[PDB]
Design a protein that fits this description.
The protein has 314 residues and is mainly α. It is 65% helix and 5% strand. α1 runs antiparallel to α2, α7 crosses α10 and α9 packs antiparallel against α10. The PDB classes it as motor protein.
Amino acid sequence: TLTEENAEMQRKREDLIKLNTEYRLKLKNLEKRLLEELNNSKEAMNIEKKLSESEEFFPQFDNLVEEYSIIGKHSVKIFSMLEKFGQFHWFYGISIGQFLSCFKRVFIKTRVDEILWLLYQEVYCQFSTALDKKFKMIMAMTMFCLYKFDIESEQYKEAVLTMIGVLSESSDGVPKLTNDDLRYLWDYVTTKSYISALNWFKNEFFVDEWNIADVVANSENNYFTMASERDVDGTFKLIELAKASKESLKIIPLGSIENLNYAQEEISKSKIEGGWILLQNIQMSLSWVKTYLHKHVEEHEKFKMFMTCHLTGD
């Protein structure tokens, strides 16, 4: 935030660095001049004045770091339950440098309210494409709670908690409502269409939901992991997407050693000259993948490569 969000913060940081360098250079020049004068027996004032002028920056820095603290607490909570989903299942891992990159993208894409809303929407659309639908709406309602319970009063919070409780069959009670929305919410929960209530909360807050094409388009990497349950398969959907993307997607199911060698040759060719390779059901030769693909991973453009795994698998 200090580096990029405000040009004043970075310009005073650079000014402090330049003032320190100028003071050191002036001290060295004064020492050399004193040695020369002893052997033979303006700039320092300007540097001192510049240092004294730049010393009037601590209250400004304190104000800037204080004004951006609630967003920091929100980010800590966001990372908290993002990492907590990594413990519920073995398929919801969340990185750290990826979070740094997505914050940089938020900077690239009431100033405080606007920037926190932008962070919420962009981090949600970049980090919620790695969950199944029920856990996606769990993320939706948790993030909606962290937004609303901090930007709204606590009577609205109590109303939301008692609506979640009657949704969870934990309690029954009339909420202390305070418009045209919660009346429709009570109409839905009296109609008992629960997924309609969840979709109504979503449409009440969420305005955009990234699809598969956008999430595979908004990336500069060449390695992608594709996951689906055993009752679903986006392989032919990926063929249709690649046809829309005018890319040659060459599906290779794993299997016998000849199939593994063919897949290795094809991905070598696709790294050499480009192309799209969809390794169907990479759980097939799990150890072969875990050795060969890991060794290959650990630079040609217009090359994307996908995995394929299953939820109830290895």
